[PDB]
Design a protein around this ligand. Structure first.
Ligand SMILES: Nc1nc2c(ncn2[C@@H]2O[C@H](COP(=O)(O)OP(=O)(O)OP(=O)(O)O)[C@@H](O)[C@H]2O)c(=O)[nH]1
Ligand SMILES: Nc1ncnc2c1ncn2[C@@H]1O[C@H](COP(=O)(O)OP(=O)(O)CP(=O)(O)O)[C@@H](O)[C@H]1O
Ligand SMILES: Cc1ccc(-c2[nH]nc3c2[C@@H](c2ccccc2)N(c2ccc(O)cc2)C3=O)cc1
Ligand SMILES: Nc1nc2c(ncn2[C@@H]2O[C@H](COP(=O)(O)OP(=O)(O)O)[C@@H](O)[C@H]2O)c(=O)[nH]1
Ligand SMILES: [Ca+2]
Ligand SMILES: [Mg+2]
Ligand SMILES: [Mg+2]
Lengths: 326, 437, 427, 54
């Protein structure tokens, strides 16, 4: 009978994982402050990685990778992509970005005055540099500014923007498992590049949207649309590139966060956020380190966390993931 | 030449000191009676082994050591053990009644009755020193004597030898071989009262030594004897530069200069490789590159923690054996790329290297196999603060209910010394955290 | 590190005598005091309990006290009765009539100074006296009333030595008189103030163990005292033999007692054996661990699942794997960790000693500081107030000069002790 | 990767490799504290003896 503690009550994904564990009859949940746990479903901030793996007689496992924030912070992801030789200054899949503080960005925006090319960026969106730079100083904290993708792929009927959330699970062995169910999070508003301050058709976040149910189109429909409208498949036109981006990011930070020879072990669920332009090119927007899941897919994905990340380490009495081979 | 005096305090300190002096004698060719056929300067010398051994007109080489325990059991084994010849009876100081795992009993009640005698014996060795460098103090954090008497001794040594360096070798408490439920209390109390009196302290977590013995020596349930022979190897790597010809870490002052830029943050992580079982018949001998790479594996550290998530302020490599500079720089070259090694901005990214050609000496019949090359890495990384966090958490758990506090108050300590010592620890963790982010 | 042993009244001298029989056999000392053993672990710590006499004989550091001569002539006739130093039989003639007031204030006070004279002559031959252990019951008059008088006076003369007791609690299942709850409540009031460590030996549990587990339909004090001497041997193993620990009474108090008044220990033993009949399959380390934590192996009739463990000591005896003992001990904690208070980290400590007790290859002794012990004091408190609310049987005590007030104080101290245990079981 | 301060001798050699440049209380106070602690023990103990005398 394995043991686990819960330290993030606000977690929909692990609210499910703990209910699944208890219902196998072979897991018992302890009080959050009891140190004799096998598994820590930990808190998001200041998780005590330094108190793990010092329990004699306890294999210990936690659902976060120490150091993985360097991927899941707008400003940290920029610094990691610009300074790691594995991810050249030119990734070809990351949008141009700079970390401006509020108390070399201008060198590039001026370049766009040469050809009067697109010059929309984001934090929030604007067209002149001053409009935005005054906004990062009005907020007070570090913002990151980034080239807005002025020609996104638009779903018809609707002429609508969208982003793709992929859920990636990385187990204690550093296997990279990409959940096969993605979600498109679409804008019900027809896209138009004239009024940015009306950011209902630009910001494609589910909340910001307070054709398809829940402004969410799963991979079944989207692959069918690509076949009918563009004569290609989701795998060929977009998913190859997504698997390449996931593998590249996670292979980059692997020496810094791997728990292979460590006295405790980590896995973590990531949500990768992508953006497909009109030439069927895939771009990486952000990496979310504590992602939520779509309602239809909570059952399948939380069960698969148990199978792959937890029961893999603590066994009990065809698959939903693609292994990204590195 | 400049002499060093070793002081061993309590059970852990005395037993580790015995392991070390046994090892020193094998490494310098001094037999259990203290005769050293190699010393042709009879009854004298300013050789660098005279840093640790004085000589009699009869040519006996006597450790510059004082052993002190508040009870007689342990030092009595020295007094009748195989190296009973080595020490002068005046060097072995014993009480009748020990500290009972109670910091305040060792520091206040019992400590107050023996501190003048011990400092009088310490003064007798200092008077045989032409230019004394300072002290190496061995002790547990956990014992009542180790924690409480050592912190009283460290205060007085500052008073009496204001100009002398003091180094610590400190055994950090592990539940797998622990003696007392209150060791977190004693650990914090002795750290708080000792911090400003110690220039450099090497913490050995018994948990880490224990797991190296199980993994790499294949010992099912390590004994103190297994732990101490491995610990004494590490101590020997660290002190070899004081006892041998060389140009790195030649006096105690150089340890501070090389490993401690900020004075409170004086706890370097030690990492040792290779640890090879002596029953392992076929052992492929490890290369310079392999043993150096192993210096960045947490499984080989004296304290388990993750240096990838801290920053370095300094780093020394200490090799014993068939090692030449070129292999070390080649090994360092390819490890710089493959590893997360972040130094603080106000420190150069670099390594001080020391090579001693005599390969490691191993106790005959012990557990460590002889090897052709070994390395001890000393790195001042903020990740060692993980150990402070663990201890302080355990202290907070007990002290919030004031569990066991009456044992300390009943020895004349005030409850407030607890929260004072804890607040100092709180500032210590905050210092590490500023430097390391 | 000499211990001075005192045994007082009928129960105290009966379990006292069994203790010295059992450990004497373990240290290889015969009934005439001569050592006839094989190992040297037997003699390394022999001085904790034995003084050495000319002729190289070993004489228990034991003072035998009673207000009646009856039981003590029984000891002197018993098998090992000749090993005791005869000057150390200190006894009166009146008895105490199962009356705490007689033992503590009238009869006992007449005799206590000559007991303290023997205690003093024993202490003055000690290199480093740890302190004292007293065997006694709380239900009669001598061990109860005079036993706690001795403790109060020993603490006045030796305020900085450890005071340790084995205290047999009364039970209606093995009951001599109706006034046992009065004597026990008055005694617990003294124990709470003046001892560092008391092993609560519940005649209720010894009876239930004899009846249910050992299948003895009519337990006697002989059947009970077999269980008591096996426990007493087990809990003192660390004092009498060498370990990785250099174990003594103060280190035990430091690690077992987080708050001064909560020093009442639940002892347990495994395997539970009836006297005479031996069984030939040694237990396995998994079995020892499970039984010694089983409520059925506890010598205080308290359910450990109704409280929490503040601290635990476990002492394994015999040839066994220390790896497997560490594994099984870590297994029982991590599996039932809710019954261990989380605010005392690592509150379970385990020792192994090579020499098993007589007639077993494997045994395990358990010492628990559990908040469940409040069940024992509640029980005695309910029996006390049932009579006391009608002042029943008080005249036996007011006739010796006692006031009702002193009963109200003792009851109220014992109820505070109960509330203090409930404080930390919820913490 | 810069190597510096190479010192050689018959026992071994030492040196330094740069991969990148940068970017007390008195005896009498002790004596008070200890003697204060011993007085607090004596107070506590005299209180016990006063109580036992009662
Ligand atoms: N590595 C190692 N650690 C030891 C050794 N002996 C004791 N320890 C550690 O020291 C801690 C307790 O401190 P001790 O040094 O044994 O106690 P002490 O110094 O004699 O002080 P007292 O309380 O008076 O006995 C234990 O938790 C052990 O882990 C040893 O020989 N080697
Ligand atoms: N370079 C770019 N070009 C075009 N559109 C972009 C863009 N960068 C972001 N967007 C769009 O605008 C939105 C801005 O929201 P942002 O990316 O800051 O939210 P988020 O992804 O942090 C929310 P959550 O954490 O809930 O996923 C993105 O979600 C995406 O739809
Ligand atoms: C949670 C806990 C419990 C005890 C200790 C500790 N520390 N030192 C000593 C103890 C006990 C003891 C307990 C079990 C195993 C070995 C020692 N003990 C002892 C003394 C006399 C005895 O008759 C029996 C036991 C010591 O001497 C530390 C933590
Ligand atoms: N376990 C056990 N309990 C006893 C024994 N003798 C007496 N008792 C208990 O002690 C109580 C009587 O007190 P007792 O010690 O005999 O009176 P005393 O002579 O004044 O000390 C009774 O409640 C019994 O249960 C014995 O041999 N073994
Ligand atoms: Ca010389
Ligand atoms: Mg000791
Ligand atoms: Mg009777």
């Amino acid at each position: 009978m394995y043991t686990f503690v819960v330290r993030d009550e606000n977690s929909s994904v692990y609210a499910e994982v703990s209910r699944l564990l208890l219902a196998t009859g072979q897991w018992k949940r302890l009080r959050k402050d009891n140190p004799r746990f096998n598994l820590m479903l930990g808190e998001r901030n200041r998780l005590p990685f330094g108190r793990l793996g010092h329990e004699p007689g306890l294999v210990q496992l936690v659902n976060y990778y120490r150091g993985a924030d360097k991927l899941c912070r707008k400003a940290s992801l920029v610094k990691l992509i610009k300074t790691s030789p594995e991810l050249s200054e030119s990734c070809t899949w990351f949008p141009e970005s700079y970390v401006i503080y509020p108390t070399v960005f201008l060198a590039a925006y001026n370049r766009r005055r040469e050809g009067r090319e697109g010059n929309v960026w984001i934090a929030l969106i604007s067209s002149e540099a001053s409009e935005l730079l005054d906004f990062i100083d009005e907020q007070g904290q570090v913002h990151v500014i980034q080239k807005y993708l002025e020609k996104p792929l638009l779903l018809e009927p609707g002429h609508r923007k969208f982003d793709i959330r992929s859920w990636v699970l990385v187990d204690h062995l550093y296997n990279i498992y990409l959940y096969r169910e993605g979600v498109l999070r679409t804008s019900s508003e027809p896209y138009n590049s004239a009024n940015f301050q009306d950011k209902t058709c630009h910001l494609t976040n589910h909340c910001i949207q307070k054709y398809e149910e829940g402004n969410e189109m799963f991979f079944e429909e989207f692959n069918q649309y690509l076949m009918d409208a563009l004569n290609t498949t989701l795998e060929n036109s977009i998913l190859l590139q997504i698997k390449h981006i996931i593998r590249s990011c996670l292979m980059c930070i692997e020496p810094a966060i791997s728990t292979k020879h460590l006295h405790y072990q980590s896995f973590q669920l990531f949500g990768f956020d992508f953006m497909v332009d009109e030439e069927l090119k895939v771009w990486l927007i952000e990496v979310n380190g504590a992602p939520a899941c779509a309602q239809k897919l909570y059952a399948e994905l939380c069960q698969g966390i148990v199978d792959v990340a937890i029961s893999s380490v603590f066994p009990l009495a065809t698959s939903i993931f693609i292994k990204l081979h590195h | 030449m400049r002499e060093c005096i070793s002081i061993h305090v309590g059970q852990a300190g005395v037993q580790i000191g015995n392991a070390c002096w046994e090892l020193y004698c094998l490494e310098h060719g001094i037999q259990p009676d203290g005769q050293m056929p190699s010393d042709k300067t009879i009854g004298g010398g300013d050789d660098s082994f005279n840093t640790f051994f004085s000589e009699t007109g009869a040519g006996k080489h006597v450790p510059r050591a004082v052993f002190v325990d508040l009870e007689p059991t342990v030092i009595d084994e020295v007094r009748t053990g195989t190296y009973r010849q080595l020490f002068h009876p005046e060097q072995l100081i014993t009480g009748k009644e020990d500290a009972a795992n109670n910091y305040a009993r060792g520091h206040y009640t019992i400590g107050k009755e023996i501190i003048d005698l011990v400092l009088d014996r310490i003064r007798k060795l200092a008077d045989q020193c032409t230019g004394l460098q300072g002290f190496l103090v061995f002790h547990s954090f956990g014992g009542g004597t180790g924690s409480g008497f050592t912190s009283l001794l460290m205060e007085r040594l500052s008073v009496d030898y204001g100009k002398k360096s003091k180094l610590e070798f400190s055994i950090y408490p592990a539940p797998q071989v622990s003696t007392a439920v209150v060791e977190p209390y004693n650990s914090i109390l002795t750290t708080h009262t000792t911090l400003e009196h110690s220039d450099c302290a090497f913490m050995v977590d018994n948990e880490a030594i224990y797991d190296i013995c199980r993994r790499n020596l294949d010992i099912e349930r390590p004994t103190y004897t297994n732990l101490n022979r491995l610990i004494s190897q590490i101590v020997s790597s660290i002190t070899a530069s004081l006892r041998f010809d060389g140009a790195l870490n030649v006096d105690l002052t150089e340890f501070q200069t090389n490993l401690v830029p900020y004075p409170r943050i004086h706890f370097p992580l030690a990492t040792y490789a290779p640890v090879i079982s002596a029953e392992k018949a076929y052992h492929e001998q490890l290369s310079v590159a392999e043993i150096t790479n192993a210096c960045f594996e947490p499984a080989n550290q004296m304290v388990k923690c993750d240096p990838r998530h801290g920053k370095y302020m300094a780093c020394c490599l200490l090799y014993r054996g068939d090692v030449v500079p070129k292999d070390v720089n080649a090994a360092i070259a390819t490890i710089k790329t493959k590893r997360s090694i972040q130094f603080v901005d106000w420190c150069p990214t670099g390594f001080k290297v020391g090579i001693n050609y005599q390969p490691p000496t191993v106790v005959p019949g012990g557990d460590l196999a002889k090897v052709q090359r070994a390395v001890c890495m000393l790195s001042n990384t903020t990740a060692i603060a993980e150990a402070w966090a663990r201890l302080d958490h355990k202290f907070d758990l007990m002290y919030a209910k004031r569990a066991f506090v009456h044992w300390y108050v009943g020895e004349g300590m005030e409850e407030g010394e607890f929260s004072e010592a804890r607040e100092d620890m709180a500032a210590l963790e905050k210092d590490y955290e500023e430097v390391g982010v | 590190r000499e211990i001075v042993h005192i045994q007082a009244g009928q129960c105290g001298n009966q379990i006292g005598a069994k203790f010295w029989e059992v450990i004497s056999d373990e240290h290889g000392i015969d009934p005439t005091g001569s050592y006839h053993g094989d190992s040297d672990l037997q003699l390394e710590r022999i001085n904790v309990y034995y003084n050495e006499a000319t002729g190289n004989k070993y004489v228990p550091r034991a003072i035998l006290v009673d207000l009646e001569p009856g039981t003590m002539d029984s000891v002197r006739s018993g098998p090992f009765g000749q090993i005791f130093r005869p000057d150390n039989f200190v006894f009166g003639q009146s008895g105490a009539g199962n009356n705490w007031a007689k033992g503590h204030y009238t009869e006992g006070a007449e005799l206590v100074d000559s007991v303290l004279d023997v205690v003093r002559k024993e202490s003055e031959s000690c290199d480093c006296l740890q302190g004292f252990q007293l065997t006694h019951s709380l239900g009669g008059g001598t061990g109860s009333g005079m036993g706690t008088l001795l403790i109060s006076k020993i603490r006045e003369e030796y305020p900085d030595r450890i005071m340790n007791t084995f205290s047999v609690m009364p039970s209606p299942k093995v009951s001599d008189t109706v006034v046992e709850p009065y004597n026990a409540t008055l005694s617990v009031h003294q124990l709470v103030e003046n001892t560092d460590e008391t092993y609560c030996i519940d005649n209720e549990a010894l009876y239930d163990i004899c009846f249910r587990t050992l299948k003895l339909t009519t337990p006697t004090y002989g059947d009970l005292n077999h269980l008591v001497s096996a426990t007493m041997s087990g809990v003192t193993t660390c004092l009498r033999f060498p370990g990785q620990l250099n174990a003594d009474l103060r280190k035990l108090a430091v690690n077992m007692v987080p708050f001064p008044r909560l020093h009442f220990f639940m002892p347990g033993f495994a395997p539970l054996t009836s006297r005479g009949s031996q069984q030939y399959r040694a237990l396995t380390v998994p079995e020892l661990t499970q039984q010694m934590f089983d409520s059925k192996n506890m010598m205080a009739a308290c359910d450990p699942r109704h409280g929490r463990y503040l601290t635990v000591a476990a002492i394994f005896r015999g040839r066994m794997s220390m790896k497997e003992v560490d594994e099984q001990m870590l297994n029982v904690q991590n599996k039932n960790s809710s019954y261990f208070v989380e605010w005392i980290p690592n509150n379970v400590k385990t020792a192994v000693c090579d020499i098993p007790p007589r007639g077993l290859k494997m045994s395990a002794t358990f010492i628990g500081n559990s908040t469940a012990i409040q069940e024992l004091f509640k029980r005695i408190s309910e029996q006390f107030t049932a009579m006391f609310r009608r002042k029943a049987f008080l005249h036996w005590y007011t006739g010796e000069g006692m006031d009702e007030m002193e009963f109200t104080e003792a009851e109220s101290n014992m109820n505070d002790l109960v509330s203090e245990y409930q404080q930390y079981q919820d913490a | 990767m810069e190597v510096i301060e190479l010192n050689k001798c018959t026992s071994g050699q030492s040196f330094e490799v740069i991969l990148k440049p940068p970017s007390d209380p008195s005896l009498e106070e002790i004596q008070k504290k200890l003697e204060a602690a011993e007085e607090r023990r004596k107070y506590q103990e005299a209180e016990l003896l006063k109580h036992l005398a009662e």
